[PDB]
A paper describes a structure:
Although ACE2 is hijacked by some coronaviruses, its primary physiological role is in the maturation of angiotensin (Ang), a peptide hormone that controls vasoconstriction and blood pressure. Full-length ACE2 consists of an N-terminal PD and a C-terminal collectrin-like domain (CLD) that ends with a single transmembrane helix and a ~40-residue intracellular segment. ACE2 also functions as the chaperone for membrane trafficking of the amino acid transporter B0AT1, also known as SLC6A19 (25), which mediates uptake of neutral amino acids into intestinal cells in a sodium-dependent manner. The ACE2-B0AT1 complex exists as a dimer of heterodimers.
During classification, another subset with 143,857 particles was processed to an overall resolution of 4.5 Å. We therefore define the two classes as the open and closed conformations. Structural comparison shows that the conformational changes are achieved through rotation of the PD domains, with the rest of the complex left nearly unchanged. The PD dimer interface appears much weaker, with only one pair of interactions between Gln139 and Gln175′. The weak interaction is consistent with the ability to transition to the open conformation, in which the interface between the neck domains remains the same while the PDs are separated from each other by ~25 Å.
Numbering used by the authors:
A (entry chain B): 60 to 263
B (entry chain B): 332 to 398
C (entry chain B), D (entry chain D): 603 to 738
Amino acid sequence: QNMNNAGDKWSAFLKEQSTLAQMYPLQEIQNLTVKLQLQALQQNGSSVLSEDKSKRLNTILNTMSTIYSTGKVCNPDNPQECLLLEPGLNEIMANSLDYNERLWAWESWRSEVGKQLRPLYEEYVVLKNEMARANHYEDYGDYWRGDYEVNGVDGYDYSRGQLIEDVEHTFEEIKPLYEHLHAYVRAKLMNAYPSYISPIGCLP
Amino acid sequence: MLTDPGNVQKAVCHPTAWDLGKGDFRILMCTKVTMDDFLTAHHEMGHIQYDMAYAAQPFLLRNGANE
Amino acid sequence: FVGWSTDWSPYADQSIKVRISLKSALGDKAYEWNDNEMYLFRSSVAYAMRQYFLKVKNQMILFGEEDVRVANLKPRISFNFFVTAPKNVSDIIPRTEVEKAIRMSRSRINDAFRLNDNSLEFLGIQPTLGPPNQPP
Amino acid sequence: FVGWSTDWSPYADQSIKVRISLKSALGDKAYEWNDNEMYLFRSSVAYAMRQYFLKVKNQMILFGEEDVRVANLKPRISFNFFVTAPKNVSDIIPRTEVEKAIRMSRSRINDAFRLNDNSLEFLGIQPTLGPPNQPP
C-alpha cells in the first residue's frame, strides 16, 4: 500500500495536477518528451472508480486460480490413482503416444475445470465492464489494448480497431503453408494413429 | 532480499527487476540457488538498459513500448 | 491437396439425415412446420430409444429430447441428426443400433405426423414390408 | 356441517378428466393399455401445448411429458390430469387456454391411438365439426 495508498496520497494529488495537465490534446502536441506523459497519467491505479466491488472480485479470482492449480483427474481403472494437470496430464500427452488413451485424457481433463469455473465467469465479464466503464472505456479487453493506444508521431499511432486487421492480412497466406502441412500430417496421421483421420478433412 | 535456498523464511518470491525513478533500478530475487535468475539476468539487462534511459525521468515516462 | 473440407468430424458418420416432405403425404392444406415441430420430433425421437433399449437391450437408460442433437436445420424439413447419451455426453449412441431402433418403431412416427415413409426419409433406412395374400 | 371432502384443492378445478374407451373405437383385438401408454400420452399431451403456444400465443416455452401431471390412474385409461409450467412449478397453466389448446389438435391425437373422440372424452370439450355438402 506504501505504493498504492501512498500512491493514493499522490493519486489524490494527481487529481489536482492531472486535471491541471488535462487541458492539452493528443495530436497537436509533438514534443514527445511530454506527449506520452499524459498517456501514462491514468496510471498509478484505478483511483477514479471507488474500487469497493473490484476488491470484491478478488474473492472470486482466488477461487478461479485454485481450481486450475489443483486441476486433477483421478483415473477410473483404479480410483485412488490420481494425476494432476502439471505432473500427470501433460506427461500423458508427452509420454503416451496412443490415440484413444490420449483421447480419454483429452476428454476427462476437460470434464473437470471449465464447468466449475463457468459460474465464475459471467459476473467476471460484466463486473470488469463497469470497472472498464468507470475506467472510462467500453470493455476491459479494450484496456488490454489500451497500452497499444499510442497516438504520438502522426503515422506512428495504432488504433485499437486496426491492430488486428493487419494480423488477418498475415495468416491467410500462411494458411496454404498449413494446407501442405495439413496434408503432410494427414499423410502421417493415417499410419501414426489407426486411420480415423479423413485425409481430406479437419484434424482431431 | 536474495535468500531462499530451500527455506520457509518469510520473504516474497520471484526474480523481478525494477525502475524506481530518481536513479534507482532494483532487483528482487528468490534464490533457490538456480539458473532461472541468470536466465533473467541479461534478459533484464537488455530491458533495464531501456530503464537506464528513464533513470531520473518521471512516473509519466515509464517502461519502453508495449510488453 | 489444397485446403480441407471444413465440416468433417469423426462423429459425423453416426449422424443421420432425416428428410421430411410435407408435400408428399399430407401435401397441401397441411400444417406449416416450425420450431414446435422441431421440438415435437426430438421428443418422439427419444421415444424410439426407450422402446428399443428395454425391449431389445433390456435395461433402462433415460432420454430427453435434448439428447437428440439437431444440426443443419432446413426449412425443407431436413437436417442431419444424431442422439447422445443423456448426460454422459462424452459418449454417444452408436449408429449401428439406432438403425435397427428406427426400423422397430418406424411405423409409429409417420402417423405421429400423418406421413407415409416417403415423407420419412432416412437415407440408409427403408421399409422392408408388405407381402400380400389376397387369394384363398 | 360434519367432516370435510378429503380431496378438494383450489387447483383441482384446472384438472381435466380424460376418459379412454378402448372397447368403443378399436373395440376388441386391440392392444392392452399399460404404463407405456401412460407414458406415450404425456408426451403427446406436451405436443398440444407447443403447437398451441407458438401458433396462438406466439412465444416458445418448453414442455416435457413430466409437466403433464397424472392423478387417479384407472384401468379404463381414465384419470384427471393437468399440466404445469416446465420448472416454474410454483405456477401452472390456466385451464381456460388448455380448452382451446385441445380443440386445435383434437384431431391429432385420436389417430395417434386409433380412436374416435368417443374414446377421447374430456367432459367439457366436445367436437364441434361436420357440415355436409353432398348435393351440387
